[PDB]
Amino acid sequence: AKLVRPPVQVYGIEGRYATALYSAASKQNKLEQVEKELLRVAQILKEPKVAASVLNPYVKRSIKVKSLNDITAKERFSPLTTNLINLLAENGRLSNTQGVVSAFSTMMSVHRGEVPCTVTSASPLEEATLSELKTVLKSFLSQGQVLKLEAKTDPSILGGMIVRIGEKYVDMSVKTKIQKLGRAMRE
Amino acid sequence: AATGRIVAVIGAVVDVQFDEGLPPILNALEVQGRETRLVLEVAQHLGESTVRTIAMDGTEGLVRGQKVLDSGAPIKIPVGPETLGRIMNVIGEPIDERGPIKTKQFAPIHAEAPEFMEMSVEQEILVTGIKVVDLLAPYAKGGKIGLFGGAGVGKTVLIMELINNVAKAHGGYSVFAGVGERTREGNDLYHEMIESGVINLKDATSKVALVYGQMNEPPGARARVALTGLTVAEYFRDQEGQDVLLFIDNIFRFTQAGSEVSALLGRIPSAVGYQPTLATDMGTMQERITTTKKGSITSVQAIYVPADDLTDPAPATTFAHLDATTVLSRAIAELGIYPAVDPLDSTSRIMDPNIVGSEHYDVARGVQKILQDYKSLQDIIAILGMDELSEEDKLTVSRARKIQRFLSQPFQVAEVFTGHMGKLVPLKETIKGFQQILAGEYDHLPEQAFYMVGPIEEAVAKADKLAEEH
Amino acid sequence: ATGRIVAVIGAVVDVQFDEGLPPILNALEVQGRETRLVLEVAQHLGESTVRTIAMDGTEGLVRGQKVLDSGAPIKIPVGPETLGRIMNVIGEPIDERGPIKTKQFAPIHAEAPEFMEMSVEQEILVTGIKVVDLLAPYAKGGKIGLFGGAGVGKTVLIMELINNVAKAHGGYSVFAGVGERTREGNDLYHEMIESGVINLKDATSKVALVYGQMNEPPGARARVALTGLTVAEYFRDQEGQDVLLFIDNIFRFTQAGSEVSALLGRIPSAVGYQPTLATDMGTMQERITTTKKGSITSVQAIYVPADDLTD
Amino acid sequence: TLKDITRRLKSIKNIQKITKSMKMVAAAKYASEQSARMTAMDNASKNASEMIDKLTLTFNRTRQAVITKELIEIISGAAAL
Amino acid sequence: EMSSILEERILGADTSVDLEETGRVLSIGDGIARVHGLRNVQAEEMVEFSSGLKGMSLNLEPDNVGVVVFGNDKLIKEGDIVKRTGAIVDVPVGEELLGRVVDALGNAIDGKGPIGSKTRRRVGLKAPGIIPRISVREPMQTGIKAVDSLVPIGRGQRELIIGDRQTGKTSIAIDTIINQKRFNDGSDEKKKLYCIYVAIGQKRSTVAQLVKRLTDADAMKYTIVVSATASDAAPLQYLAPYSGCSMGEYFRDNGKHALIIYDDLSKQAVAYRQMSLLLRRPPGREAYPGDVFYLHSRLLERAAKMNDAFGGGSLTALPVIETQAGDVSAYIPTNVISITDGQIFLETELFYKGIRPAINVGLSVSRVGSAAQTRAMKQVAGTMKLELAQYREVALLSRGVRLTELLKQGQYSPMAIEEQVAVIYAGVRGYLDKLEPSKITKFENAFLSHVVSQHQALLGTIRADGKISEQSDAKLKEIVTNFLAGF
Amino acid sequence: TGTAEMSSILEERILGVDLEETGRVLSIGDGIARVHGLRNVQAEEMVEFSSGLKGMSLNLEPDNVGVVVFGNDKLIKEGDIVKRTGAIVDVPVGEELLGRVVDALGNAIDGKGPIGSKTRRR
Amino acid sequence: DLEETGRVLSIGDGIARVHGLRNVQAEEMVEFSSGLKGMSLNLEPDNVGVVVFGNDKLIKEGDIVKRTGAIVDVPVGEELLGRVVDALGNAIDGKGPIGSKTRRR
Amino acid sequence: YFRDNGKHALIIYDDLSKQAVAYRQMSLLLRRPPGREAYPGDVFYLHSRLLERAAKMNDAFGGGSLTALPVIETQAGDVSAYIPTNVISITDGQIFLETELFYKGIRPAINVGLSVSRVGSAAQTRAM
């Protein structure tokens, strides 16, 4: 049977299950719907009681899938996500579903056209020039694209900026310029 | 037809993921976006619409996500009389700078072996002009021969002497497949065949086709070039009925090449580290090099023996596929005896008194018996010296040393090493000389009178010269 | 940085860090132990985890123990007062004579001297012994193999080489004890105290002792030659001396490296040795050279297994 | 094969012992046939020593190869799990 | 000087920043770094780690890239940034490398500054095909009587120097490098030979002493030295032969003639076995990977002789192999014997018995050999080999002792071809058969001094016409007879 | 990890054919076809591929079947349909075989015509 | 209390993979449910490899494993002279218990 | 215990080959990487740290001692096996026993040309 592969490809059991889910949703156009669904599922699981109920390797698979089918019939979840959690309970890959959730997120994160930018500076960033750099980084993209800019600071880089657009990488920091000038005067 | 994307590159092993239209196993795929033509051959279906393929050229510069196109058929090479006088590589491209090979038909290099009802049973001796070969392990017309030997013992010199004698006296569209051998030797053979008139660069009446994948090629080319040359020879045999000669040097490389990729295909290794599919790969390749009722293929194959083992799985597996094995020994070549054929390890299937005659058979068996007796005596000879032997034992030792020396012979292609002019001894002179040495008709000649001579007349002449000059 | 133990399998220990991973070949100190237990980073496993080998016993280690990073591979107290004194791989005094009150500490796992630091001239190291200096002369910055046994006088030859190099030249000596029997180590200590090479009551000792016994994990026995090599490299490169480095058995260095690589799960080699046998021998023997400041000359007792010189 | 080489080595070793003993007794009794016996047994002993050296080389080679082969067996068996 | 730094190290200093593609180290250990990212990296492309190290993208996998680290992995941590270079692994090539000592990546380790190279060449290029080549015809003179007479080497050949440890293999290579000085100083530019010495797994002090031996003989001016010594990473010892081979392919491709020595290939095979076992690859015979033959064969196939349509240049390779206990039947020795065009067997029995160079003439062969020998050397050496074979057969008997006593040679003393012809002539014509052997070398020495001081015209004639004509035959006859009467 | 944990099986399983008497080839290579389904197949039972090739169910695994192929695997692709025949291997026996040359499955290969025996045996 | 008490997760030919026991020391003596004792030789992130001082027919998946808190030790002293003990110091000569007053690692 | 309390002890391990076999089994089932003859990496360690506890204490520590007589069972007299190699390199000598001397009447069948005692001559009594 033909499969619809997402624009980003994730690997591991996490990637395989999330790819299966995406290629199932793309045939019926319920992508953000099942995104909402798995968001609710992940926040359901992250509570400690049911988590230890499903993380226990002593609970027999029928018992834990019983609790899971009960709780998913509780929240009137779509048959797609109920089937997915049923498969995670069948194959015993259930404890890892969080990653799958995260995986699917990142997958749809490139479905809406977002690119993650990470800006490191030696100083906590200002507001004006931060918006300026946001505008500058937007010019490196195609239309229909969004910037997920998250600027954390490293006060050890001695200045400048280190910008990471996807995996493209520009090192405008001053410590690297110092190292390069030292290498130049040495060789 | 179908288009896929490279998803992994490990050495010569490239994984290709297809959207729609997965290609069958053994298909050829063209990697898109390269300077030269890079062909991948499908080997497995990994699932997930992914296939695993072996590359026929280098894989450097390949990027994950690169486009790959499916051809819909295995590697197809041009076959016909227009391949005569040309050099082609593993995928059928001319590598002699003489333009495209404009044949009317192309054949896939993967084919089925001839059936059992197509086998031919005839056994006629092929006279090569070499004493030890024609005496102790005679070759057969249309039979698979095989020449075993370690590193630097005389495989290529012997195969070139066989080329000279047989292929020059022949009239049947020889084919030479260089598999994992020296490129220098390929150039040498090309030019010595040009100057001998066997390859005609103009006014094309050539009678040998060359196919070359040498030491510098990646494992995939070295693993399929044997099949390419085999395919050329199969065309000449079946769709023309001709009497083909096929020379393969060196065929062990084929096996070795598979090993080099076996690990990368994710397969648990066999005994010495080889692929688990060594014997069936050798069988699918070797069962096509055969004489049928449609035509005749005389196959001579050089077979490298790693670290002089002969029990390494590749030589051991090859032994069962041949009709006349010629085993070269390093211990013999360290005595100066050339060709270094081991007399007590070379066999033939026509070594039968009802095929070679009672004279030939009895002389061969007697030579081997005397040499075996000398071999068994060698231990006490080295410990207690020859002075402690019986008189009959000293007689058998003397005749055995004489037979050792007489088994050697200068080759036309070895004048640079031996200094002597190459001698081509006919079969009856071989039989008669060895019969006479056995009977005791030369108990007075010095043993050095037999080293590197032709027929026994030259041995008597050399003894006369040694006696008079010294 | 502080990390936590996440796996203890015999002598290898996995530690997971939160903030900053230590690089390979870095000493980690384990917290709460009665004695001083040092792990040495051998591999980065991903997920902020690090596989290390322990330089001591790992019994009583519990998953969750705090592991403190140090910053340097292993720093041994190095200086002119390690002489006449015993210390282990970690650089702690073994002879129960108090701490080594030295001024500087040198890190194990240094680099071999650069190409331009090498000496282009071969030069004899005069040892004052007639049969050695005449028929088989020793070279400055070379390696020598003692093919001796027990019956022959070998401790005497070693002590006399120490004395002669200290007198005819100004060179101090270092005796590494790679995988040595504790009984033989005590015997050698007392023989070198008796013959005046070690002075317990003065500062005229002419040798520093470094011992990793046979009851120590493979990591300790593998790094113990580098500890002595470091305490000799100090003398060479900061006193211009012609040091003499003894390695009581160089085969046990090889087999300790073999055991270490087996514990780390690597595929063995011809006969069973580490796949990194040649590079492991080289990264050590290359530091024994004759630089433009001094020279380390090494006397290394050889053991051929199964009497095969092709092993 | 290891056991074959070991058997043959022990054979040649006892032969060398016997021939050197015969050289001793021949040099003793010689003090024209005893001389020939002494020199011939000397030749036999040195030739046996040469064969012992060569067979010892081959034995060490074979036992190293045996260790390698068994280790590779164990390793490939462990890697299949 | 304050202007040796401020001249241009700051003005033109590539201080720019650029949009670069990067990956992040996941795990490092066992000489292989797993790298997440680098989506558009190529197979066998050079990448650069944050510490300034370099690596080769070996395994392109779906979710990571296995990179071979060319250096010590103690400088790489998980989380380090790995940049793309965009270039498949390549080294600087050109004339500017002559006289320089470099490491396997082309960086100068002689402290004489940067190599001002303008051209770079890949290390993994494929050898020339069948058509670009042509048979070996020109002689590659080693200056050693035994080699140059009995085991001749031509330009474009592969000749193995195989033997136990401490039998004189490096010495043969160093004599061959020193001998090319008489041609590199002459006028004929088609006889100049630029030598390359690749030191793999050797002691670094030994390489420094080798460079001094080459500098005292004034031979470093035309010699590249690539050094990947015992303490360098196994990937560097694996790469050094291909770096040196590309440096020599530069000369082979531009109508010049290069010579390369791999000292030695056994240590490169050991380094590759380490890299393969650390990659969990199945070990074969002696735990070597299945593709160690390929490892050496793709290397030694690049030593070729091009025809006059492809420049006419050549590259001669003298790989060195160290055997254990004289076992030539081992795995790697037989591999390289299968690849090369002949061997030079050095023996421990001969080396210990004072016969140096300890070449085993019965086992040393040269598959090409005779096609690349001068006419005079051929005249004398055919008869010399005939008589040596006769002597080893009956092991005349005194003539063989004379000749083998005559084949001994000193270290760092490569003789010109004419002087070897004169010595071999005086040896093979009988003019010392009655001289008792112990003095032969002495005679040799004295005799050669004679011929080089006073009969320079005969040697010049021999050098010019290449053969020893009947006029020069009788001239050398009377010279040696007059000397033998005087000696 | 997981042979049957391929993304195709997973997606059409979470999304929603007789997988008792029929299977689908997950992977084919070197003459070993992994087959998903065939839940009723017996150990050492002979199955039939889509291309006419036969196989023998040698590895009954929790999520797939390792089948050894009786021929050239170039005629087997991923996703092919594998049917049961319900029988272990068996060959024709009797007096009718004397003088005939057969293959490993009792098929005549000497071109003298098909075997005319009446009884078969496992 | 999954820190001083684990629960057998797997058992095979002498080896017990025990889940839990987050505070157990390497090479510490633990006590299974059926009375057999074991030594924690492998401390892995998800389980503990315990070698059993007994047989596997008595323990099965799901059994409980308690913690002792001390490394493996043996009764030493004069009282052992004349007594035949097993590898743990328990008397197997039927002459009663060992009157040992000192234990030693 | 006796060593540390000023007394003198002797301990025989009969034999260490079987302890090494038991440890090999344990570690192989714990999935630890096997080495030569499937022995773990620290199988030398296993014995060395056992045979190093046999010591002679100076009189400042009580003056006690602990003498170890480990036993090793070779196969066809092969002393270059893995475990015999380890224990030979660990101990202060060995007493070889041979079958060929066992049957020639030599009993105890001690092969004296091979039996070693590095610290023995210092132990003998003056008369002996």
Ligand SMILES: Nc1ncnc2c1ncn2[C@@H]1O[C@H](COP(=O)(O)OP(=O)(O)OP(=O)(O)O)[C@@H](O)[C@H]1O
């Ligand atoms: N032709 C010669 N005549 C006299 N002495 C020689 C000759 N060649 C070498 N030697 C001496 O014997 C020694 C052999 O060293 P050499 O490096 O040449 O051999 P090798 O095979 O390279 O050994 P290694 O494995 O250590 O590199 C040299 O130090 C040299 O002094």
Ligand SMILES: Nc1ncnc2c1ncn2[C@@H]1O[C@H](COP(=O)(O)OP(=O)(O)O)[C@@H](O)[C@H]1O
């Ligand atoms: N018939 C022969 N006569 C004399 N020498 C020979 C003969 N055959 C081989 N040799 C010698 O043995 C060497 C190896 O020959 P070759 O066949 O090219 O090696 P290989 O086994 O790798 O193919 C040759 O260089 C040659 O000197």
Ligand SMILES: [Mg+2]
């Ligand atoms: Mg050949």
Ligand SMILES: [Mg+2]
């Ligand atoms: Mg050398």
